[PDB]
Amino acid sequence: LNHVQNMLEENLKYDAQKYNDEVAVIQKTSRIYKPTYTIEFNREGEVLVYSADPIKNSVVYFKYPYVLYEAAIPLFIWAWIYNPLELSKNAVNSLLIYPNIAWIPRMWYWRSLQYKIQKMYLLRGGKVAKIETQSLAGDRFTSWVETYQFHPLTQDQKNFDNQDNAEFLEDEGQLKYELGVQLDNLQEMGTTSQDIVINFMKEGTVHHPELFEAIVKGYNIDTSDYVINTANNLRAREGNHNH
Amino acid sequence: DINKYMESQLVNDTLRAFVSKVGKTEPATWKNYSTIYHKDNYEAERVRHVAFVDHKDPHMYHGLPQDYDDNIKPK
Amino acid sequence: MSAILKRAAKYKRVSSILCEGEAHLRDPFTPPPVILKPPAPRKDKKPDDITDFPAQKLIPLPESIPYQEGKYRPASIPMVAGFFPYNCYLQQGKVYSWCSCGISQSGPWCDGLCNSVVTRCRPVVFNVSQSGYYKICNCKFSANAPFCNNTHRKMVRYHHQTHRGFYEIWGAALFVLGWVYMGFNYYT
Amino acid sequence: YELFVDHPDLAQWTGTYPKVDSSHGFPFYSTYEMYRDFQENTLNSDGSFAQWITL
Amino acid sequence: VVFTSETPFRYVGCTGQMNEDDYEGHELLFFLLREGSLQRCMGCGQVFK
Amino acid sequence: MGSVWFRNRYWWYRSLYDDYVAREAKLAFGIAAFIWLPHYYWGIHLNRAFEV
Amino acid sequence: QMFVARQVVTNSKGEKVEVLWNAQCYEDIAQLNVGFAPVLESVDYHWEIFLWADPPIKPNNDFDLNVPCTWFEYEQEWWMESCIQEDQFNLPEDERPYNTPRNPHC
Amino acid sequence: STSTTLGLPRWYKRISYYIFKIRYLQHTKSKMNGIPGSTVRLMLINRHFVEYEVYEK
Amino acid sequence: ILKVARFRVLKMRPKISTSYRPHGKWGDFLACIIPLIWCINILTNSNLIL
Ligand SMILES: CCCCCCCCCCCCCCCCCC(=O)OC[C@H](COP(=O)([O-])OCC(O)COP(=O)([O-])OC[C@@H](COC(=O)CCCCCCCCCCCCCCCCC)OC(=O)CCCCCCCCCCCCCCCCC)OC(=O)CCCCCCCCCCCCCCCCC
Ligand SMILES: CCCCCCCCCCCCCCCCCC(=O)OC[C@H](COP(=O)([O-])OCC(O)COP(=O)([O-])OC[C@@H](COC(=O)CCCCCCCCCCCCCCCCC)OC(=O)CCCCCCCCCCCCCCCCC)OC(=O)CCCCCCCCCCCCCCCCC
Ligand SMILES: CCCCCCCCCCCCCCCCCC(=O)OC[C@H](COP(=O)([O-])OCC(O)COP(=O)([O-])OC[C@@H](COC(=O)CCCCCCCCCCCCCCCCC)OC(=O)CCCCCCCCCCCCCCCCC)OC(=O)CCCCCCCCCCCCCCCCC
Ligand SMILES: CCCCCCCCCCCCCCCCCC(=O)OC[C@H](COP(=O)([O-])OCC(O)COP(=O)([O-])OC[C@@H](COC(=O)CCCCCCCCCCCCCCCCC)OC(=O)CCCCCCCCCCCCCCCCC)OC(=O)CCCCCCCCCCCCCCCCC
Ligand SMILES: CCCCCCCCCCCCCCCCCC(=O)OC[C@H](COP(=O)([O-])OCC(O)COP(=O)([O-])OC[C@@H](COC(=O)CCCCCCCCCCCCCCCCC)OC(=O)CCCCCCCCCCCCCCCCC)OC(=O)CCCCCCCCCCCCCCCCC
Ligand SMILES: CCCCCCCCCCCCCCCCCC(=O)OC[C@H](COP(=O)([O-])OCC[N+](C)(C)C)OC(=O)CCCCCCCCCCCCCCCCC
Ligand SMILES: CCCCCCCCCCCCCCCCCC(=O)OC[C@H](COP(=O)([O-])OCC[N+](C)(C)C)OC(=O)CCCCCCCCCCCCCCCCC
Ligand code: FES
Ligand code: FES
Ligand SMILES: [Zn+2]
Numbered sequence: 001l002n003h004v005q006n007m008l009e010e011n012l013k014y015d016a017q018k019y020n021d022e023v024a025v026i027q028k029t030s031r032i033y034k035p036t037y038t039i040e041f042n043r044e045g046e047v048l049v050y051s052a053d054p055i056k057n058s059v060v061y062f063k064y065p066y067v068l069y070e071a072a073i074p075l076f077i078w079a080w081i082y083n084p085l086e087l088s089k090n091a092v093n094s095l096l097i098y099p100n101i102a103w104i105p106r107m108w109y110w111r112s113l114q115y116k117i118q119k120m121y122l123l124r125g126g127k128v129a130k131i132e133t134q135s136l137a138g139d140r141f142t143s144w145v146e147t148y149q150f151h152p153l154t155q156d157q158k159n160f161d162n163q164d165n166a167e168f169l170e171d172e173g174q175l176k177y178e179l180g181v182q183l184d185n186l187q188e189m190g191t192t193s194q195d196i197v198i199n200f201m202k203e204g205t206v207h208h209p210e211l212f213e214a215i216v217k218g219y220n221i222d223t224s225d226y227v228i229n230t231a232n233n234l235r236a237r238e239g240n241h242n243h
Numbered sequence: 244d245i246n247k248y249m250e251s252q253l254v255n256d257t258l259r260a261f262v263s264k265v266g267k268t269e270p271a272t273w274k275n276y277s278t279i280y281h282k283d284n285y286e287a288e289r290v291r292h293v294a295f296v297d298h299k300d301p302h303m304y305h306g307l308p309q310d311y312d313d314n315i316k317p318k
Numbered sequence: 319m320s321a322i323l324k325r326a327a328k329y330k331r332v333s334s335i336l337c338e339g340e341a342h343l344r345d346p347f348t349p350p351p352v353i354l355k356p357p358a359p360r361k362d363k364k365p366d367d368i369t370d371f372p373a374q375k376l377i378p379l380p381e382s383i384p385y386q387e388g389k390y391r392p393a394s395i396p397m398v399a400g401f402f403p404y405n406c407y408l409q410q411g412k413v414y415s416w417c418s419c420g421i422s423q424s425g426p427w428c429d430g431l432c433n434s435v436v437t438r439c440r441p442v443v444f445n446v447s448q449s450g451y452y453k454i455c456n457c458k459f460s461a462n463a464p465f466c467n468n469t470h471r472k473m474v475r476y477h478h479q480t481h482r483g484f485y486e487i488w489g490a491a492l493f494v495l496g497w498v499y500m501g502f503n504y505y506t
Numbered sequence: 507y508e509l510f511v512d513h514p515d516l517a518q519w520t521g522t523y524p525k526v527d528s529s530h531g532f533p534f535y536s537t538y539e540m541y542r543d544f545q546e547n548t549l550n551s552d553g554s555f556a557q558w559i560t561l
Numbered sequence: 562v563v564f565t566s567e568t569p570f571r572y573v574g575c576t577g578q579m580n581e582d583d584y585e586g587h588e589l590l591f592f593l594l595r596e597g598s599l600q601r602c603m604g605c606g607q608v609f610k
Numbered sequence: 611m612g613s614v615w616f617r618n619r620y621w622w623y624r625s626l627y628d629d630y631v632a633r634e635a636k637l638a639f640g641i642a643a644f645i646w647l648p649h650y651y652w653g654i655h656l657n658r659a660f661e662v
Numbered sequence: 663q664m665f666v667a668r669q670v671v672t673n674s675k676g677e678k679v680e681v682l683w684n685a686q687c688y689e690d691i692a693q694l695n696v697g698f699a700p701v702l703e704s705v706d707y708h709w710e711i712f713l714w715a716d717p718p719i720k721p722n723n724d725f726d727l728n729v730p731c732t733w734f735e736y737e738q739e740w741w742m743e744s745c746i747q748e749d750q751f752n753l754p755e756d757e758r759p760y761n762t763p764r765n766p767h768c
Numbered sequence: 769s770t771s772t773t774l775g776l777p778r779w780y781k782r783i784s785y786y787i788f789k790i791r792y793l794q795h796t797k798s799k800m801n802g803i804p805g806s807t808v809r810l811m812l813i814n815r816h817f818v819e820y821e822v823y824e825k
Numbered sequence: 826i827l828k829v830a831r832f833r834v835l836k837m838r839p840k841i842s843t844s845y846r847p848h849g850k851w852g853d854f855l856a857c858i859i860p861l862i863w864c865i866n867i868l869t870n871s872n873l874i875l
Contacts, residue, residue: 016804020804051336055481189836205332214319229353230351230354231342233335233339234338235393236394237747239753243481265674277729285581285728287433298349303378337756337757338754338755344760385765395747397620399620400617421743423618425618434731434736435740436737448767467762483751486637489638489640492640493639494611539722555853563719565716575721578723587846589720591691598680598682599680600683601681603776603783603784605780623742632746666774666787686778702770702775703770704770734781779843780845
């Protein structure tokens with residue numbers, strides 16, 4: 001097979017070899033942000049930057065068009081039961097396929113509701129961000145992501161917003177609109193996934209707007225001016241209103 | 244022999260503190276000599292002499308190696 | 319970083335305290351918060367150097383805690399032993415070690431499993447000056463621990479309010495309604 | 507205790523635990539493994555259900 | 562202390578801290594106790610020589 | 611409906627199996643509340659046929 | 663496969679001793695990998711499990727000579743407790759009643 | 769053959785769990801040491817097709 | 826089945842099983858209600874036919 005010569009194949013092989021030989025694990029960068037104020041980290045060496053209750057603030061049950069999808073089921077059930085169209089056995093049995101598939105989109109919506117970040121922390125060194133989220137079943141997922149893997153989206157969510165000049169924070173510091181950010185690689189439950197989109201609802205308090213903006217834009221935060229506050233106010237598996 | 248009892252208690256406390264400091268750990272039990280009246284050898288219940296009222300209680304470290312200095316003397 | 323620096327002037331910070339509140343105002347064993355200033359960075363970082371950060375006070379786990387007069391907040395989140403209290407007859411002057419973690423195998427009283435489970439909830443050692451029947455808490459969330467204060471009803475209400483707890487409760491409800499409807503329609 | 511000290515084999519057969527205490531630190535010279543089938547396959551032990559069915 | 566008669570290693574088994582109610586701490590785990598320094602059981606930390 | 615009746619739920623679990631399947635057990639009620647209706651109705655029809 | 667970890671511990675007599683954690687098997691010496699190399703692969707196959715006929719040992723500890731558990735003893739019930747907690751629902755502290763009347767006799 | 773437990777049949781303690789996780793990750797890295805990275809694999813899969821008709825852009 | 830197949834794999838959410846020994850004492854009795862009901866139904870139907 002290799003005896004057959006193709007310039008496109010040769011170019012692909014050359015590109016792969018050159019990439020492998022040139023690009024290394026260690027990549028240089030110059031996008032370092034130095035916050036003006038000193039950062040007060042928690043007893044655990046982390047600083048909270050975002051908090052919200054997406055489950056509390058979102059619609060779960062009566063969400064369009066899932067209500068329409070699930071309200072179409074009784075029509076199919078009645079059609080099968082009463083055979084109003086005088087169909088054959090297989091034809092009428094075909095009507096029961098819908099109820100087995102009409103609830104999937106609501107399941108997907110409920111799953112997506114768990115990707116709304118409940119809390120966000122920045123670790124020491126300004127290179128790692130811990131995102132804590134919760135599902136409708138009470139399962140809590142905490143995942144750590146390197147800051148450079150973030151990419152904000154426009155207000156319409158249909159394109160990537162310019163990292164340098166991104167307008168998603170109000171003048172005082174809060175979010176103008178629910179900000180969507182795509183993580184290039186996210187490790188959730190010990191499994192890595194590609195191009196994971198997450199959202200920060202506008203109905204959520206934003207702490208340290210400078211740090212939040214730096215994390216969203218992908219800068220590395222300089223935490224040289226840091227202080228440690230010893231406050232053991234948070235217990236393991238602490239309850240919250242995000243249920 | 245109250246004097247003998249108190250002397251034995253003090254000696255056991257000093258020995259426990261010295262051993263804890265040497266091993267960079269804390270005593271496993273505060274019983275001077277193991278006895279089976281209390282089933283501490285094979286049950287969760289322990290015998291630890293560590294009691295205090297609040298975070299600013301001076302008796303917080305009593306019975307622990309932190310109450311002795313590098314010379315093995317009470318602070 | 320020019321845009322971030324420009325907007326930093328008008329950016330404002332918000333407090334990082336949430337529904338959990340402050341533990342030092344509700345737990346006698348939690349010291350008030352204190353800010354520690356790191357020393358200057360080391361010019362030379364030896365491979366075998368130790369931290370120069372100022373030491374933080376170490377508070378060991380007490381064997382037992384006294385009775386908080388209606389101001390009890392468990393150190394950790396205890397296991398919910400039960401959703402209604404135990405009507406126990408207590409003797410006058412007898413010391414009782416009420417279980418806080420909630421996994422005790424001896425009932426409301428401490429059995430020692432607190433030492434075997436990973437928790438900061440320690441048994442509450444208390445005494446009663448008048449013998450008689452008392453309702454001892456089982457959910458381990460009562461503010462008047464070891465005595466029940468009807469906090470189990472609010473815990474049940476919160477469980478019903480939760481999305482999954484609502485589903486579980488009403489699924490069991492409809493499961494029993496299945497038996498009820500079968501009995502109702504038994505004759506046809 | 508008399509049975510254990512005098513006739514260790516019969517004590518083991520009956521299922522009695524070693525009745526001597528080695529708190530002094532020197533293990534006893536006639537210790538034996540525990541045969542607890544009689545006390546375990548009983549209505550009051552882990553074999554409670556099997557013994558109920560057998561009864 | 563586990564004794565051997567001029568042999569380098571011995572197949573040892575551990576069940577953890579023994580209690581009167583159950584007589585066994587943890588499920589039996591077998592390892593090869595070898596001559597030399599002290600060794601430890603992962604489950605319960607028991608030290609063998 | 612099970613462990614709720616017991617004021618020592620940890621003891622309930624330990625003395626039953628020392629295993630925890632309560633989540634699945636209590637989630638299964640919702641599905642079991644309706645998974646039986648067609649079978650029950652067809653059984654009613656079959657019982658009527660037997661009576662006839 | 664010989665030792666899964668090692669540590670250096672100063673005993674009560676002031677001497678530092680090395681403690682090695684042997685690889686273990688679930689009650690099955692047949693599944694146990696008997697090797698003499700720092701290798702996970704099961705390379706050595708032995709026709710005679712006991713070459714010198716020396717019997718193995720399953721020591722039984724005397725309850726009198728036992729010591730209170732201290733090897734992470736606080737973790738014994740952690741698995742079951744955390745399994746229950748994962749599904750347990752915790753009332754928020756702010757909504758949880760506080761500063762209720764004291765018991766008259768306590 | 770290689771034992772799946774890696775010498776740790778039971779994770780009775782978090783220290784044992786950490787040891788198993790470390791050794792398991794190291795073994796997985798060693799076993800994956802001979803295959804291309806994610807970026808290389810993805811680009812190869814994306815640009816595998818080389819059969820076109822007209823050229824010169 | 827769904828829970829085990831979705832979360833109990835090493836990749837997703839392994840759990841550190843620290844329990845040493847079982848402690849069940851009457852779980853067998855509690856479980857045997859269902860086979861008990863099976864036996865009762867079998868006996869009733871068989872005796873009614875007999
Ligand atoms: C002019 C005429 C009059 C007007 C007409 C128009 C009126 C207006 C219409 C408006 C609506 C238009 C359509 C909207 C689509 C919305 C899609 C959606 O939900 O996306 C959001 C949401 C987004 O989630 P996501 O994660 O972002 O992306 C989706 C993922 O890819 C996740 O995808 P996936 O990997 O899951 O794959 C998709 C699909 C599984 O993948 C597929 O099925 C692929 C699609 C092709 C399947 C068919 C293969 C070809 C052969 C078929 C024929 C065989 C011969 C016939 C006999 C045998 C039949 C078996 O998923 C499943 O169903 C998985 C579970 C399997 C079902 C369980 C039951 C199994 C047994 C029965 C079904 C067997 C299979 C289907 C058979 C269908 C034919 C009978 O998507 C989903 O939730 C996935 C799809 C869920 C079902 C969609 C359909 C719902 C019903 C729509 C119609 C409602 C109105 C009905 C009445 C109409 C007349 C009045
Ligand atoms: C067609 C239908 C249409 C319906 C349409 C819609 C209607 C909408 C209605 C909306 C409102 C519904 C409300 C539902 C509530 C559900 C939630 C709930 O209760 O849980 C909160 C509950 C909070 O409890 P709590 O209110 O704070 O009370 C805690 C106290 O420790 C509890 O202790 P205590 O202080 O209450 O003490 C009880 C008793 C303790 O003494 C005993 O040992 C009880 C028996 C004494 C002798 C009585 C002789 C008569 C025959 C008794 C037969 C049963 C006894 C069994 C004893 C077994 C002992 C091993 O006290 C004594 O020392 C003896 C006093 C005897 C005086 C005699 C009075 C006259 C006769 C009646 C006596 C009844 C006694 C209570 C029986 C309770 C069940 C066993 O949360 C939990 O912890 C849940 C635990 C698990 C509950 C499972 C059961 C759920 C259902 C309960 C409601 C039943 C409603 C049935 C209605 C049926 C209508 C068709
Ligand atoms: C010549 C004479 C011949 C005589 C022949 C014999 C007589 C006939 C047979 C009698 C059989 C008796 C069986 C029970 C043994 C009681 C042992 C005892 O005294 O324990 C001492 C025990 C410890 O004493 P202590 O340490 O001094 O503590 C005293 C404190 O006051 C303790 O207060 P506490 O607050 O700490 O706790 C008390 C109570 C407080 O908490 C509770 O009440 C627990 C459960 C409810 C919690 C939520 C509260 C809110 C309201 C809930 C409403 C639930 C409704 C749904 C109930 C289930 C569905 C029907 O909690 C419990 O007792 C826990 C039980 C949990 C399981 C309950 C399940 C009951 C299933 C059977 C229901 C049958 C309904 C029949 C209805 C008929 C009319 C329509 O004290 C008690 O149990 C107190 C009650 C005394 C016994 C009353 C028995 C009443 C009759 C029961 C009949 C059962 C059905 C028939 C079976 C046999 C024939 C087929
Ligand atoms: C009637 C037939 C008469 C035939 C006469 C023949 C005369 C010539 C004999 C020549 C042969 C002599 C040697 C016999 C050896 C048999 C094989 C054997 O095992 O040897 C081991 C022997 C050594 O091997 P090994 O493995 O070291 O043996 C270990 C032991 O065997 C230990 O074995 P393991 O570890 O399997 O131990 C099991 C044992 C261990 O568990 C126990 O400790 C038993 C439970 C004790 C506690 C129970 C507490 C219950 C609660 C309290 C009571 C509640 C009730 C209410 C009252 C109290 C109220 C408060 O538990 C059980 O399986 C026993 C059942 C317990 C249920 C109790 C129910 C009581 C209710 C009362 C009515 C029913 C009673 C049934 C009998 C019960 C048992 C005596 O083998 C050899 O030396 C090599 C083979 C030699 C073969 C020789 C030829 C044999 C020929 C046999 C011919 C039989 C013909 C008739 C057959 C059909 C009869 C119906
Ligand atoms: C292999 C592949 C092939 C397979 C082939 C097919 C398979 C073949 C298999 C063959 C082998 C079979 C083997 C069978 C044995 C297997 C055993 C095993 O593995 O599992 C061990 C498993 C271990 O136990 P577990 O399940 O983990 O224990 C947890 C409980 O079971 C869980 O229950 P829970 O109660 O602890 O948790 C739920 C709890 C959660 O809730 C709470 O605890 C919260 C507190 C309670 C109150 C909550 C509400 C409060 C509301 C406050 C007010 C709100 C605002 C006001 C709003 C309304 C007013 C405006 O809910 C409640 O307590 C409240 C529910 C109340 C609903 C009932 C009321 C009915 C009436 C309602 C009427 C309403 C409409 C009126 C209409 C009127 C007119 C028509 O089961 C066993 O222990 C062994 C069972 C053996 C058989 C005996 C069964 C009975 C004994 C109890 C257990 C029963 C459930 C479990 C049965 C097992 C299946 C689900
Ligand atoms: C000729 C034509 C005739 C047509 C007739 C049509 C009749 C229509 C009747 C509709 C009845 C609706 C009942 C549910 C009402 C809920 C109200 C509400 O929001 O309450 C919140 C309140 C608030 O509760 P809460 O705040 O404590 O916690 C729940 C809160 N959420 C859900 C947001 C997390 O809930 C309650 O207090 C309970 C109310 C009753 C709930 C009943 C649940 C039924 C589940 C059914 C499942 C599917 C099977 C259905 C068929 C079988 C039924 C037995
Ligand atoms: C399918 C339809 C429903 C069928 C229901 C069938 C059950 C009917 C009632 C049976 C009562 C006798 C049960 C004997 C076994 C348990 C004994 C025991 O542990 O008691 C001590 C316990 C005490 O538990 P405790 O936790 O408070 O204390 C024990 C802990 N130590 C040892 C540390 C002190 O008392 C009870 O809680 C009794 C509960 C009785 C109900 C059955 C419990 C099993 C689960 C099923 C619940 C079904 C409710 C049905 C209501 C009535 C319907 C008519
Ligand atoms: S406090 Fe619950 S066991 Fe000691
Ligand atoms: S049982 Fe805890 S408050 Fe009533
Ligand atoms: Zn061991």
